[PDB]
Amino acid sequence: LAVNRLFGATETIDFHPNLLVYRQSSPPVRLTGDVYVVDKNEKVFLVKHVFSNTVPAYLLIRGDYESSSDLKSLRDLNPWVQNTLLKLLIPD
Amino acid sequence: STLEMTQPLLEIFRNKADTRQIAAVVFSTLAFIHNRFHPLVTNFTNKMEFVVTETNDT
C-alpha cells in the first residue's frame, strides 16, 4: 500500500527470498510509468500502480521487464514506504 | 563455484519453481564427464533440452 494501513488479518507468512520469481519472460519487455531499480544485480524493480483507479500501491517485480530510460531514484519516496522496504529487503 | 550460488546446493532442489538453475547444473555435469572421457573441450549438437518430471506417477 502507498499509505493505507492493513486491518483484519489473523495470520502472516514471513517473507522468504524464494517467493520472488525471476520470470525468464520474453527478451523484449516494455514498461511505462515510474520505475525504481531495487537491484540491478537481481533484476529487481518497483513500479507505481493503483487498483480501482483509487488504491495507490507499489508493485515489486523481478525479471527482464525492460522499461523506458527514465530511471527514478529511491531518494524521492516516502519515509513510510522507505522503512517498509528497508525491513522487507532483509539484507540481514 | 562460478555459477552464482546465491543458495546452498540443497536449497536449489528444495525449491521446485526453478528449472533454469537445475538444467544448467546438469548440463555442466555432463560436460565435465565427457571431458574426462575425452581430453578435448568441445560442444555437441548445439540443441538440447530438459524436463523435470515431478510426479511419482511419472
Binding site: 525468464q24 519472460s25 | 562460478t2 555459477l3 552464482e4 533454469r20 538444467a23 544448467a24 555442466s28 533440452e49
Partner: protein, 286 residues
C-alpha cells in the same frame, strides 16, 4: 608481394608482440600502399568500388571510399585528414609509436622530423646498437616509396594531363576556395589518396555529362578534410553494425508465427546504408 606502407613499420622495443594487422591489401595491387586496417585505425574509412555501369561487360568499375564518422562527433572528431598545421595537435603523437610519428612527419615533408627525432634518438641504447641499422634502413625504404609516389617532376612516375576538379559551387556560393592550394601543399601521395577515394558528383563524358548525387557528401577546409555538408544536420551515421553464460533461454511453445514481416521484407532488397564520399567534378576529352 607486400605493398602496404605499414608492413614496413617495425621498431626497437623489449616487445616481441608487434601487432601488425596488415591485411591482404598488401598483396593486392591498387597503389593505396596502405591496408584497410589502417584506413580504419587512423582514417575511419572503408574502401569500396563503384560498379561503374556499362552495357558492355567492360564495366571498368572504380575505386571509392566511405567514411565512418559517427553523427555525434563534432569538429576535430569530424575532421578526417588534417593539414600539416593541425595534425600534430589532432593526433596523440607521443602515444602513437615513435617511428610511426616520424613517418607522419615525413609524409608532411617537414624538416622538423630530422630536426628533432634524428638528434633525439642519439642517447638511446638502440641508437647506440645495430638497431640503428634497421631503423635507418626502414627509413630509407620509406623514402624510396615516397620517391616512387613523387609526381612533381618529369623525371618521375606521374606525367602529362589532369582533368579532375574540386571546390565545386557552394549553394550559397561563397567565392572560390583554396582547395587546390591545399591540394598542392599536400604531398602528391595524399593527392593520389584523394584520387583513390573521392567520387565526383558529375562526370562529363567528352561531349556528354552524367550526374550521380543531388549534393556533395563531404567538404574541405584549409585545416583538413571535413566530414560534413554545408546544410542541415549531419546525416545519420550508419552505426557500426563462446564462454558459458548464466542467461539460458526459457522454453517457448515451439512456434514460428508471423514470418511475413521479416520474410517478404528480406525478399525486398535492403538498402546499402552507407556514406559514399562524393566531392568534386570530373571531365573527359578525346
Amino acid at each position: 608481394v607486400n605493398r602496404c606502407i605499414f608492413a614496413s613499420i617495425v621498431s626497437f622495443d623489449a616487445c616481441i608482440t608487434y601487432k601488425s594487422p596488415c591485411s591482404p591489401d598488401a598483396y593486392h595491387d591498387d597503389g593505396w600502399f596502405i591496408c584497410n586496417n589502417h584506413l580504419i585505425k587512423r582514417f575511419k574509412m572503408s574502401k569500396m568500388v563503384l560498379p561503374i555501369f556499362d552495357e558492355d561487360d567492360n564495366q571498368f568499375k572504380m575505386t571509392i571510399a566511405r567514411h565512418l564518422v559517427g553523427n555525434k562527433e563534432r569538429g576535430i572528431k569530424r575532421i578526417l585528414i588534417p593539414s600539416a598545421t593541425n595534425y600534430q595537435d589532432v593526433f596523440n603523437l607521443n602515444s602513437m609509436m615513435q617511428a610511426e610519428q616520424l613517418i607522419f612527419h615525413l609524409i608532411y615533408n617537414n624538416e622538423n622530423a630530422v630536426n628533432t627525432i634524428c638528434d633525439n634518438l642519439k642517447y638511446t641504447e638502440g641508437f647506440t646498437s645495430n638497431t640503428q641499422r634497421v631503423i635507418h634502413s626502414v627509413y630509407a625504404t620509406t623514402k624510396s616509396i615516397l620517391d616512387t609516389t613523387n609526381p612533381n617532376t618529369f623525371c618521375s612516375r606521374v606525367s602529362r594531363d589532369e582533368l579532375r576538379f574540386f571546390d565545386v559551387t557552394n549553394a550559397r556560393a561563397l567565392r572560390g576556395g583554396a582547395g587546390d592550394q591545399l591540394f598542392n601543399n599536400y604531398s602528391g601521395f595524399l593527392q593520389n589518396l584523394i584520387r583513390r577515394a573521392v567520387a565526383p558528383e558529375y562526370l562529363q563524358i567528352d561531349t556528354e555529362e552524367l550526374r550521380f548525387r543531388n549534393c556533395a557528401t563531404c567538404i574541405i577546409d584549409e585545416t583538413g578534410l571535413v566530414a560534413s555538408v554545408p546544410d542541415g544536420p549531419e546525416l545519420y551515421n550508419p552505426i557500426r553494425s563462446q564462454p558459458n553464460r548464466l542467461q539460458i533461454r526459457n522454453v517457448l511453445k515451439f512456434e514460428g508465427d508471423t514470418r511475413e514481416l521479416d520474410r517478404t521484407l528480406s525478399g525486398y532488397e535492403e538498402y546499402p546504408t552507407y556514406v559514399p564520399l562524393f566531392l568534386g567534378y570530373q571531365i573527359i576529352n578525346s
